[PDB]
Write a protein that binds this DNA or RNA. Structure first.
Ligand SMILES: Nc1nc2c(ncn2[C@@H]2O[C@@H]3COP(=O)(O)O[C@H]4[C@@H](O)[C@H](n5cnc6c(=O)[nH]c(N)nc65)O[C@@H]4COP(=O)(O)O[C@H]3[C@H]2O)c(=O)[nH]1
Ligand code: IRI
Ligand code: IRI
Ligand code: IRI
Ligand code: IRI
Ligand code: IRI
Ligand code: IRI
Ligand code: IRI
Ligand code: IRI
Ligand code: IRI
Ligand SMILES: [Mg+2]
Ligand SMILES: [Mg+2]
Length: 90
RNA sequence: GGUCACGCACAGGGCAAACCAUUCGAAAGAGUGGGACGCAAAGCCUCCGGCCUAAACCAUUGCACUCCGGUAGGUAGCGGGGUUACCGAUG
């Protein structure tokens, strides 16, 4: 399970890629280095975001630390990415 | 001449990108004035394919790294298609 990337969803869809990123990057950059933050608003990539960390140990903290954390009046469903990210993969 | 194409010009003209000002819009963007990058339809029309925005509404709890919900708007200076038109070495 543990992975460089954490998988978030139940994300307020009203938020925009730009700001969603900034804010996610704000909150989560507290736990380590973010190689990147992937947010798309397409039909089925929406309400979710991937947060890729430098250290796999950063992700675990994130997960553990901020589960269900209230974010834009919603709670965060956090969990690991079944797979890695092309950065971490390649 | 008229027609259907064509654009090496001829000749008389037309439009106006970026950017600025100001107005409208949530945004894309559009209006108007200034201003020209270009344009032989850069006149006009969303039927077809792209791309852009996506406040509201409706659906979607959804695992991606090409990108893509419905609806709505935009782009005709992205194409194609329709349609109107000036000049005639041209065919
Ligand atoms: N009247 C007429 N003349 C034609 C036509 N096709 C070609 N020509 C002549 O041939 C020249 C070359 O045209 P171009 O390569 O398409 O290049 C043209 C074109 O791209 C542009 N342009 C000029 N007027 C117009 C216009 O009314 N509409 C559009 N869309 N573009 C224009 O400027 C360029 C040079 O302009 P010109 O000094 O007139 O120079 C033009 C013009 O003299 C046509 O359908 N009608
Ligand atoms: N000269 Ir004239 N103006 N440029 N006619 N060719 N279009
Ligand atoms: N004024 Ir206004 N143009 N800037 N409407 N807010 N968008
Ligand atoms: N003539 Ir025209 N080249 N400008 N429209 N086809 N794109
Ligand atoms: N055809 Ir349309 N849908 N109208 N692509 N141009 N946007
Ligand atoms: N193409 Ir419409 N017409 N469908 N613009 N997107 N709304
Ligand atoms: N006219 Ir038209 N050239 N712009 N639509 N065909 N693409
Ligand atoms: N100006 Ir315009 N570049 N934005 N042509 N409309 N596409
Ligand atoms: N005019 Ir027309 N540009 N040639 N639209 N038909 N494609
Ligand atoms: N009319 Ir005649 N056909 N003869 N256009 N000038 N070439
Ligand atoms: Mg030519
Ligand atoms: Mg023009």
């Amino acid at each position: 399970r543990p992975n460089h990337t954490i998988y978030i969803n139940n994300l307020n869809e009203k938020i925009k890629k730009d700001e969603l990123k900034k804010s996610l990057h704000a909150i989560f950059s507290r736990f380590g280095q973010i190689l990147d933050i992937l947010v798309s608003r397409s039909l089925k990539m929406r309400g979710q975001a991937f947060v890729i960390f430098k250290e796999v140990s950063s992700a675990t903290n994130a997960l553990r630390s901020m589960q269900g954390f209230p974010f834009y009046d919603k709670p965060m469903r956090i969990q690991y990415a079944k797979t890695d990210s092309d950065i971490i993969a390649k």
